[PDB]
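Hi,

I'm pasting everything inline rather than attaching a file, because the server keeps stripping attachments. The sequence lines come first, and each chain or strand is labelled.
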Amino acid sequence: QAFTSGLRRYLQYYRACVLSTPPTLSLLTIGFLFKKLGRQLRYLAELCGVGTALPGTGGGEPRAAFPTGVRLLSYLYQEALDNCSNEHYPVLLSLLKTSCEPYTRFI
Amino acid sequence: VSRILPVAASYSTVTRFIEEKSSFEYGQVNHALAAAMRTLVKEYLVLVTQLEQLQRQGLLSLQKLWFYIQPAMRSLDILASLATSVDKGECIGGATLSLLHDRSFSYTGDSQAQELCLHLTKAASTPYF
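And the predicted assembly:
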């Protein structure tokens, strides 16, 4: 709940950034403008695997899926501890610091 | 458009439910719940009027509109779920108060939901309590 609510809101902010630009940007320039965003998506979706019509990877590596339950919280916390200060690693770090508030409520 | 429309369908359900539940025979505390639902609908209507004014200013795409509606859309979906849980068996009286306490417990996961549950429980139980 907290993790993917964070994902939805962060994607809303990302969509604000994406729609903030004109739709007539150079394809290479836009790709570079999302290269860090692309790295963040690849790192997060490698832990997500959100293919719908053809299931499997939703970005990043061949992401079959995401870890389960609060075991997904455990794997995500360990990953965010190791993979830090990157496109998704800092994004995931901020998301984990936010879910600490969900952890505060869980307390 | 359909993605934004989920809130529209939920609100069409909520408005019809509020009109139906506004019957006095459903209960005085039930009347208070219907009044609270109508006030929430009025706040959503104020938001929709702001949305029409922004449509007059031309500051969205369909996806951006859905993104802006997302907070109120989640609240309306939660309200529709709660209304279904209540009125499907017509939880009225202290059965509806127990349902309200259970809803506050189920909203303890989301702080806004828990706070709104406590506040609305106070408002509804004011007649019954």
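The interface with chain B takes residues 1, 8, 12, 15-16, 19, 105 of chain A (CB under 8 Å).

If the labels don't parse on your end, tell me and I'll reformat.
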